[PDB]
Amino acid sequence: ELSPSIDVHEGKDTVSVDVELPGVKKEDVQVHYDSGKLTISGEVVNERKNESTEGNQRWSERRFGSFSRTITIPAKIDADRIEANFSNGLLTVTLPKVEKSQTKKQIAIK
Amino acid sequence: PPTVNDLFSDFVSYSPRLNNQIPGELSPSIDVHEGKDTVSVDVELPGVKKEDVQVHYDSGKLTISGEVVNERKNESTEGNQRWSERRFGSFSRTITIPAKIDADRIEANFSNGLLTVTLPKVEKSQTKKQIAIK
Amino acid sequence: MSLQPFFGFPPTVNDLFSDFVSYSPRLNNQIPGELSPSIDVHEGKDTVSVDVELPGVKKEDVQVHYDSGKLTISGEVVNERKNESTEGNQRWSERRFGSFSRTITIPAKIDADRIEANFSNGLLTVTLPKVEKSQTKKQIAIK
Amino acid sequence: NDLFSDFVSYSPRLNNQIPGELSPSIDVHEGKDTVSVDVELPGVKKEDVQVHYDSGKLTISGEVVNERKNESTEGNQRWSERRFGSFSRTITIPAKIDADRIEANFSNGLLTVTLPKVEKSQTKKQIAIK
Amino acid sequence: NDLFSDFVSYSPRLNNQIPGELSPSIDVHEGKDTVSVDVELPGVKKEDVQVHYDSGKLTISGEVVNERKNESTEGNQRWSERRFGSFSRTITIPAKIDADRIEANFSNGLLTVTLPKVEKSQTKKQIAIK
Amino acid sequence: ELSPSIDVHEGKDTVSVDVELPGVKKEDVQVHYDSGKLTISGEVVNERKNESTEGNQRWSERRFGSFSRTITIPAKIDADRIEANFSNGLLTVTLPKVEKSQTKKQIAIK
Amino acid sequence: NDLFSDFVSYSPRLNNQIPGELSPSIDVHEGKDTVSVDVELPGVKKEDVQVHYDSGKLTISGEVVNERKNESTEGNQRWSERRFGSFSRTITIPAKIDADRIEANFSNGLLTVTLPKVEKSQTKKQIAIK
Amino acid sequence: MSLQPFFGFPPTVNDLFSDFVSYSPRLNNQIPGELSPSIDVHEGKDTVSVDVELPGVKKEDVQVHYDSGKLTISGEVVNERKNESTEGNQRWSERRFGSFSRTITIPAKIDADRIEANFSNGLLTVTLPKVEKSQTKKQIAIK
Amino acid sequence: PPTVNDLFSDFVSYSPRLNNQIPGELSPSIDVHEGKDTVSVDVELPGVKKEDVQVHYDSGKLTISGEVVNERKNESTEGNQRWSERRFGSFSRTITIPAKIDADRIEANFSNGLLTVTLPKVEKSQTKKQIAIK
Amino acid sequence: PPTVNDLFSDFVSYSPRLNNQIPGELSPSIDVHEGKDTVSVDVELPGVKKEDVQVHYDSGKLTISGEVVNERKNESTEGNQRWSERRFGSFSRTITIPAKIDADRIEANFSNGLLTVTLPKVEKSQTKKQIAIK
Amino acid sequence: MSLQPFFGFPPTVNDLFSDFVSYSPRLNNQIPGELSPSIDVHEGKDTVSVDVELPGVKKEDVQVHYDSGKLTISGEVVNERKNESTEGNQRWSERRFGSFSRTITIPAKIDADRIEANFSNGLLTVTLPKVEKSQTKKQIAIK
Amino acid sequence: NDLFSDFVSYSPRLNNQIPGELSPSIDVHEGKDTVSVDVELPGVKKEDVQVHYDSGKLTISGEVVNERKNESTEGNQRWSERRFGSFSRTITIPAKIDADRIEANFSNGLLTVTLPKVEKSQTKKQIAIK
Amino acid sequence: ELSPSIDVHEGKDTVSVDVELPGVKKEDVQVHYDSGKLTISGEVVNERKNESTEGNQRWSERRFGSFSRTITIPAKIDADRIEANFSNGLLTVTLPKVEKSQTKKQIAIK
Amino acid sequence: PPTVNDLFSDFVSYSPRLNNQIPGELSPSIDVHEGKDTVSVDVELPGVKKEDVQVHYDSGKLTISGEVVNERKNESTEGNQRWSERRFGSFSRTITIPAKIDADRIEANFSNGLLTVTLPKVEKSQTKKQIAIK
Amino acid sequence: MSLQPFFGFPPTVNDLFSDFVSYSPRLNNQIPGELSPSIDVHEGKDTVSVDVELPGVKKEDVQVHYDSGKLTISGEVVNERKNESTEGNQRWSERRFGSFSRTITIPAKIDADRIEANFSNGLLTVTLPKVEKSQTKKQIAIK
């Protein structure tokens, strides 16, 4: 019952996925890519579960537990160049597009 | 009443994954219609100037974004808010258009705080059928 | 807890009740079957401004009136795509349509004839100037 | 009828009661054609009570006087149940009424304020929208 | 222990939250000798967060930035669950603590503020009574 | 803010769609089929909105208003033989499958 | 009008709802001369619904059937929003009514029960006091 | 706390609401300006007895009637010492005088014509016999 | 609404000393009137047999006591109390008569659950005066 | 916490269309996993006999249905429910399998009130890749 | 309203409080961090049965104990697919895993040594036989 | 400590008070090693009070007697604040205790029941699961 | 804010006053008689106020503090034979009447 | 907690006649003691100047009266009351002295907001007796 | 009703909670067994004054201290007539005696060393000067 927040963006050559994982060890999270499915899974651990002793928990605003979340990628990816980078509790997965393809247009409003 | 922020997404199936809910946050209301020749996207943006809102079409995805600004925020004092029901702040919403569209012919109009985006379909013919109810 | 409205009231709390009983939509003339537009109420020591959100509403379709300390904004939100939806064209609908009415009791003395309203970009701003001395006071001789 | 209106109108402390002012008892009977407010005011002279009507808000004010207040009579108090000093109370009138037809009546320490209703507000002000 | 103290201390809106500012999630664990406040701050640089301590009130502030905000990338958004912009939160600390011994630690988007307790307030100020 | 309840079933030759529309006139509901999209729309009318008079409404458990609901049909349909039937407030749309195709299997549980 | 009467009457669980029975939606409009109860019952045959009236208590009962229940069709379900099985609901009628003049109407899955009012109870029974 | 009436109701609680909504004086036809006599309600699996306290009330001044599941006991409590009090004779007064009415909704099927009432020593006992099978049931043919 | 149990007492002045309140306990209601020739004490005792209530006059003090008995208490089971507003149990109340009385001529009557005690005064003459209100 | 009754549906996109919610109704909990060679569907069915539950596979759709029966319902009286948290009644849930499957090799097992359905994929090879986190 | 628990309590209501205070999960030994299994409690005039839902729980992983009027069912729900989820295999998850504990205070006199428990098809049924006369009563001599 | 346990235990009417029985006042002090229940019982003889302990439930019972009840003394009552008749009260003990080590003390109308705690229940009964 | 319960009875030769004083030491209560005024005063002590330690107070139903209560005796008393007796938390003061005087009458009810 | 405004009154016996209660109004707290030689009346008057309070003795009745004035009332604005527990306004309280007193020798002292009135009794001798408790 | 603290909070209400949580006696360090003196709190834009009622309290018996935004006034109210009451001299008692403590959390930045207190006629007035810019602010370097 813990869902990490996720953003998804798409550029010319790139599809990037942001996952919010504060207090999560790099070792604890797994990134997988299968046939257009990108799965980010893992577990966020309570580092106070190490004890019930020596004074206790006054306030719980934090969610802890196992999480798995799947993004479908409609575009075709080169899976060998896929990169994952974990910084400041933010996990960013970069998926290179096999085909750099037709880009945006800004629409002016009358 | 939770609201899906990005419509008809190919990326993520809306479920009880991350709520994003926290009900009452700014979510400009969106109506979408598909006719024979056209896709219409209506977005409610009361109290917004058209130069503050941008519309971008990319590869079948219409993104409407901008900033709803409190104008009484012009100082930290001098008269108070007695009541606030209005929702301010940034917004970005993406709709995945359920049809193939001619991007050169897309138009946007802003009237009475309502933004309407017209997206003519590349295939203009009649597939549709009304079924008589016995 | 809720005993704070029991013992001697700080004038502030007596204001809190004024704000509640004034601006809360459920406490003024609820239809209920109509739509209630979102509003922001601001008060300087001079005027009081009300900002009402009316996206997709034509200026001809909104009316603002004032009667004895109560401001009412009413009108209609028409669904222009109604027939399209009737033709099976609807894909996504977040929009609510119908007649709207919003009444708020204003907790200040204002000059009624100086009330003016400006409608732009789906936002209706009503401005009620406050006067210190009531010009309507009217003492009544007792029999 | 989904009615909190009587409460916002009549209830004493929604109308901003002023500490230091006594709050008189009140009965409100609305007719088909009118609305009557009976106010209990024992021991106050007719010249000590003012009735004002503004913006839909009826305000009864004045001073309940202890005639025995003076210095000649001091240790003379034996039993005291009575409250003296200033009194002010405001009540909101829900009905549409005629502000010029409003009159008051003081009999046996009971003050009756009878407010004539109208079918249509003479007071309704339509606004620009520019 | 008849304890609303945790509530007045920790609860977000008793501490006067400022509209326009995001409210981060917080875990508070008080020890025998100390009190630790764990704050979740994913995606914010260490230089974007300030920790102030005043009069028993801990205040964490800053800006969560969307690095994709710029004009080059616009129609690139696909799915958005993330909240950006400014954040400020204040929490009252019930315990007697050492204000000079207070330090902060930022690891994996988790900011730990560890406040050392004292047996006796160095801060207690006895007053005149003249 | 009114959503009529909908069931969907799929047989060998047939896909059937049930819609709950109590108190709805046959004339008030429209059925459309476009490229695999079946849309059921219309409006349920309050027949007491004909009056506020002669005694009033004590209890509201009923939803009234415009409704539109779309079912995607993955199978290919012969659109000319599509039939709609309205009985006892239940609207049933029958969509004949172009291809009668591979059917079920019951799995026994060990 | 100090009225909880509509609540005791109409509210589902004051009337003792039976677990295992579905509770249909209801609109109640009382006229000057009558009281009408509109009940939503889509997908149920006219012979599957019974309307009983006893001691001031109206009871609508029956069975919503899934016609697709059988064994021939099993793995055929795709999307299910619909509730089936037995349904029973009782509602108390505040008004004085004519028990013999009570009739029902089933149209478009909407069942209208129209109960004629009386000025004077034919049902009022005066008691001994011995 | 009050969430116990939220999740699946034990039939017992559904009874608790029946008792409340049946016998509570505030929830049935309150005047309010009249007097509400104290009552005890007892139910065996066979009958149901109601004991109403009416001290100083003449038998001619009490009436009991039954209409469609609702039992009503009404009447008057006269102050015989009224003129004495008017003459300045009153010393201590705990007694309340006026008209009384008490209506309770009975949550059982009874035989109305077998209802009988006995009034003795200021206590009025009404007895309503319960029948298992309702004799008033009346199925209604649907058009 | 606290009730003083012993009326016009010479022994104890009712004040906020011991409450005895615990509102809702059995307190048969008492009216007392004093006329020119007589003192009347009316006590409400619904559902009480006259043989269950005793009245004693001692030296200017009228004591009325007895037992209000629940008759449905005839077993610990067999049908239940669905509702109880009635107050049972023991009661004793003392009134100090505000006049001198002839004890031989005191009478008590029990009718309709109302007990009335009549106490003729030894001094039967007219002291009383009505004052005309100007 | 609303629950989507039919998983991964091609027919209907879950949104705020018909709620079906009425939280607390019977919804046997479902976990779904997809490995290299297999699709596993776990359904919680406490207090259910295996002969009361049926599993049907049709054209990529796994339907699990049955009846959760209260066994204390054996009479309308004789001892009462003091408490009920258990949810009884009928259930039918459909999962659209996110892979192509060999239907002849599908198996179902019922143990400790947990039903597990195993669905071997027709394509058994390794597409999957773990991405190292920098 | 909530005043029904104010005036003289029908014994029934005093029971309603007994049921609440007995069986409500929030009112007995909440962890809170653990899982609370759904239960049905039934009482005949002879025994009392508790039905606890434990799908996916091995018989070796459940324990039932009784101490001084309080029945406790505890254990663990293991996620066997945990490593699969760790490998990125998870598609849909409604299931909750962890340690579970459920304590209920039983409002009856039972024979502790005759308590027996049967676990089948994910349902654990505990049976506590009631005895009229308490065999544990133990009068205490007063000094 | 999230503690309603004291309430369920000690509160009078959760323990099923019996109408017709008086409810004595009680102070409960739990120690590290024990739990003490002080009960106020003025005017009752030591032989008129019984203390029972069962299944974790302490029950104090008996009769407060009016010695002046008799017929010889009748009109002798002047002022009455005192309550007489039967009294019964039950209280649940949260702590693990030794049932055989339980004793009572009556001094100055104050009855002290002191219940020794145990670290481990001698009473804990593990159950089959077959 | 503690008032001990008090009963007052009057016999032929005797006026008796009962005071409820559970947990009160005999030494802690004073009985005085002045010109027809009988005053019972004193203090009831918390014997757990001896500590805040070693485990604390879970439940307070008991009143503690100073109490003084005065009964006016209309009859004339021989003050030398006045007796006070403290038993089982019940304090009983016996005041002998100087004049044994006119006694009761039982009234029969018609 | 209702408070009787005039102590030991010969005029009116406090009962549930006119409440006067409206709990929370200004009632300066009063303690009264009677010793062998003296009657002491202590009245709490915090924040009151002695010149604002008057004491009058008439025929066995001590009347203490005056005005408790809010001093922050010095304007209708300029800073606000955030909290008020203090009770202001007029007060007059009468005590009927339960002994005969020498009026020439009565004294009043005002210290720390506590007014103490000393009333020496005309009869100074020892009637009082302590009763030994057996 | 109580939903007014649900939707977007007017800053005013957020103040109402500040006042409640600051000055309410039950919400700060209640003994409970001690006495809580009546107080008036006033705030100008410059200072904040607290008026505490302590009749019959010697100046030597009152103490005022300030620690980290919390002002505490404590002391003792001695009953000088205690022995008189012990001698049976008491007639009427409205006065409450014992130790008193009152703690309020002050919702403003003040200069602690400029806090001064004046005790006269049983009224203790504490004066806390407010400074706009906190001199205690103390930014903390993050590791």
Swiss-Prot record, chains B, I, J, N:
Induction: By heat shock, and under conditions of deoxyribonucleotide depletion and DNA damage.
Pfam family, one: HSP20
InterPro entries: A-crystallin/Hsp20_dom (IPR002068), HSP20-like_chaperone (IPR008978), Small_HSP (IPR031107)
Subcellular location: Cytoplasm; Nucleus
Keyword DNA-binding included in the entry's annotation: no
Any single GO BP term: response to salt stress
Domain sHSP positions: 21-134
Molecular function GO labels: identical protein binding; protein folding chaperone; unfolded protein binding
Keywords: Cytoplasm, Nucleus, Stress response
GO cellular component assignments: cytoplasm; cytosol; nucleus; protein aggregate center
UniProt key word Metal-binding: no
Additional record remark: Regulated by the spc1 MAPK signaling pathway.
Protein family per UniProt: Belongs to the small heat shock protein (HSP20) family.
Protein known as: Heat shock protein 16
Organism: Schizosaccharomyces pombe (strain 972 / ATCC 24843)
Protein encoded by which gene: hsp16
Curated annotation (Swiss-Prot), chains C, H, K, O:
Anything else known: Regulated by the spc1 MAPK signaling pathway.
Family of the protein in this entry: Belongs to the small heat shock protein (HSP20) family.
Record's subcellular location: Cytoplasm; Nucleus
Keywords on record: Cytoplasm, Nucleus, Stress response
Protein's recorded name: Heat shock protein 16
Induction context: By heat shock, and under conditions of deoxyribonucleotide depletion and DNA damage.
Domain sHSP: 30-143
Encoding gene per record: hsp16
GO molecular function: identical protein binding; protein folding chaperone; unfolded protein binding
Gene Ontology CC annotations of this record: cytoplasm; cytosol; nucleus; protein aggregate center
Coarse class of the protein's main subcellular location: cytoplasm
A Gene Ontology biological process term: response to salt stress
InterPro entries linked: A-crystallin/Hsp20_dom, HSP20-like_chaperone, Small_HSP
